Write a protein that binds this DNA or RNA. Sequence first.
RNA 1: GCGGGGUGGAGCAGGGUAGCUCGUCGGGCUCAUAACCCGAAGGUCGUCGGUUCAAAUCCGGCCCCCGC
RNA 2: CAGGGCUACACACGUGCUACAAUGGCGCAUACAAAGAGAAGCGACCUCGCGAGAGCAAGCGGACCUCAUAAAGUGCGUCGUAGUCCGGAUUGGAGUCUGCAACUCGACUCCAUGAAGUCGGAAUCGCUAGUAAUCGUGGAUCAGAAUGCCACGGUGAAUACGU
RNA 3: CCGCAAGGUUAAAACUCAAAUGAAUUGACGGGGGCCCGCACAAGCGGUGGAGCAUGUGGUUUAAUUCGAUGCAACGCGAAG
RNA 4: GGCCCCCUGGACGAAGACUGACGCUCAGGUGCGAAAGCGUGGGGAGCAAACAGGAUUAGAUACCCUGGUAGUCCACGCCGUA
RNA 5: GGUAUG
Lengths: 70, 102
Amino acid sequence: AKEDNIEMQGTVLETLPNTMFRVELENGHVVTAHISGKMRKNYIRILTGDKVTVELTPYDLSKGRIVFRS
Amino acid sequence: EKSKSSKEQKKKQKVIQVKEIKFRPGTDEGDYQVKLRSLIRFLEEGDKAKITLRFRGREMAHQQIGMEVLNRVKDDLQELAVVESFPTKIEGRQMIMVLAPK
RNA sequence: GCGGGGUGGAGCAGGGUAGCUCGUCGGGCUCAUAACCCGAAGGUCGUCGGUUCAAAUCCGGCCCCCGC
RNA sequence: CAGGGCUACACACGUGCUACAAUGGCGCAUACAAAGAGAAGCGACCUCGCGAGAGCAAGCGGACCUCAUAAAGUGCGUCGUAGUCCGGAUUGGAGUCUGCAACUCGACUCCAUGAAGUCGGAAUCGCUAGUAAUCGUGGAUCAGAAUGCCACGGUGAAUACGU
RNA sequence: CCGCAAGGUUAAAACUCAAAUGAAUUGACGGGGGCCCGCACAAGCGGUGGAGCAUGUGGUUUAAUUCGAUGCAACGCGAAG
RNA sequence: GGCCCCCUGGACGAAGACUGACGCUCAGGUGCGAAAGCGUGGGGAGCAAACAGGAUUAGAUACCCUGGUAGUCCACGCCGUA
RNA sequence: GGUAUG
Ligand SMILES: NC(=O)OC[C@@H](O)C[C@H](NC(=O)[C@H]1NCCC[C@H]1O)C(=O)N[C@@H](Cc1c[nH]cn1)C(=O)N[C@H](C(=O)O)[C@H](O)c1c[nH]c(Cl)n1
Ligand SMILES: [K+]
Ligand SMILES: [K+]
Ligand SMILES: [K+]
Ligand SMILES: [K+]
Ligand SMILES: [Mg+2]
Ligand SMILES: [Mg+2]
Ligand SMILES: [Mg+2]
Ligand SMILES: [Mg+2]
Ligand SMILES: [Mg+2]
Ligand SMILES: [Mg+2]
């Protein structure tokens, strides 16, 4: 019933305070992503250079949620 | 004998020690500049510098981030320094460039 | 042009009689990491000989190489 | 379902076993245990084989029969400090047995081979007495396959001022 | 306003937070103090760490090297084959 | 915070005698006010910010060591805070 | 006896 997200791969270009990250996506746009709750709870660390899946919203293409780290 | 004194005057020859600034893969501009300053001093005051980068846990998987830091130091300390050693492999978790007074 | 020196990867000690520092790898210690601790591998020592009982050593050549 | 893998091997570590010898190895002779298992099982004597074993075949559901000579010991002989008459890894050849089947991947025997190892850096483990140490013995799993595990005796110490 | 100066004195607000704070209670912790115990140390005796081999694990390899156990309290552990 | 002298403020007790509410508090005001600090001039043994050298360390702009300037002392003025 | 850091 909720509106759908846009999943997209990207590389973490820098880490920011409190589990915030710059992530350059496939399309080349740099979004300020934040960690998912599930990844926070399960303690999956994210680092500069890590390849991440990012859920984006059409409401804002400068922001995302990192849902997976590969 | 006060002979000794001869050494005291001999000992007014000199001595170089190597001083070790440890960088980490993601140190920030502020602290880079602090540590960069430390090295300028070290070097200008006639000393060597074992610059070490020290990957920690998974960071060892993006060694190329590290190498860029070292390469930035080399490129800043350019007119003050020559680069005795650079590293290529990441023995242990370290990368231990040694710079010397130009 | 004139010199210095070429010594484990690193650089530096060392008339015969090759270490030391840091790499390099592994181990120990710790709940863990750095620190700390132990072990091993790395040279034949610029090269070429002469010459010395001795060749890093002595003496020269040469390769030099940068300083200049 | 068959075949393969769990047995891989530049390498790092845990727990073991066997050593480096003479307080020993080898030869010959000769003392002293405890505890346990057994029916498609334990299998004697006897015959054969260098031996692993094979054949024949009693007995025993066991304080009866069988596994089943304890070994270290003691005595005498030899070796004489050597990489050895130490060590027994590895490899070749030849076998035995279990199992439809031992190529990958068994155990054991025979002949040959005879590696590293000469008491182990930093560091680190166990133990206060029938203990540690050392010496054999048995059992469970199990067709076969222990240096592991679980039990059993033999010989049998040292040291503890102290916190 | 005061001061040569250093500064002092008088003294807000936007904003942001849902706390900040006091005393005491129970723990835990201290390179605080005091009293004890255990082969904890010390005293010993024998080992491990070196060697070869057995065995488990990591790693690496592989078509697969089945899964599980991971400081003490995984690693001759589940697996007594 | 040695001892001595000179000058000087307060407190307290004993008995009285005396004055007769003359009291209490106090915005503003005025003065005093550790140490550091400031100005001017002296002084300077010891100590010691800064600083210099020696160590330590991953680093050591520290703690530690050897030195050491302002200052600490005096006069006068300022500062007016703990 | 004193080193830091999660
Ligand atoms: N430097 C760095 O980055 O790290 C090193 C530092 O951690 C060493 C450590 N230092 C200390 O405690 C300081 N305590 C204060 C006096 C000075 C110093 O001593 C220390 O271990 N000290 C030792 C002496 C020492 C210095 N370097 C190597 N060893 C020491 O004995 N410290 C004493 C203690 O820990 O009780 C004590 O502080 C002391 C006595 N005398 C001195 Cl100096 N220090
Ligand atoms: K003001
Ligand atoms: K407010
Ligand atoms: K009044
Ligand atoms: K002074
Ligand atoms: Mg009053
Ligand atoms: Mg003053
Ligand atoms: Mg003055
Ligand atoms: Mg002083
Ligand atoms: Mg001082
Ligand atoms: Mg105040």
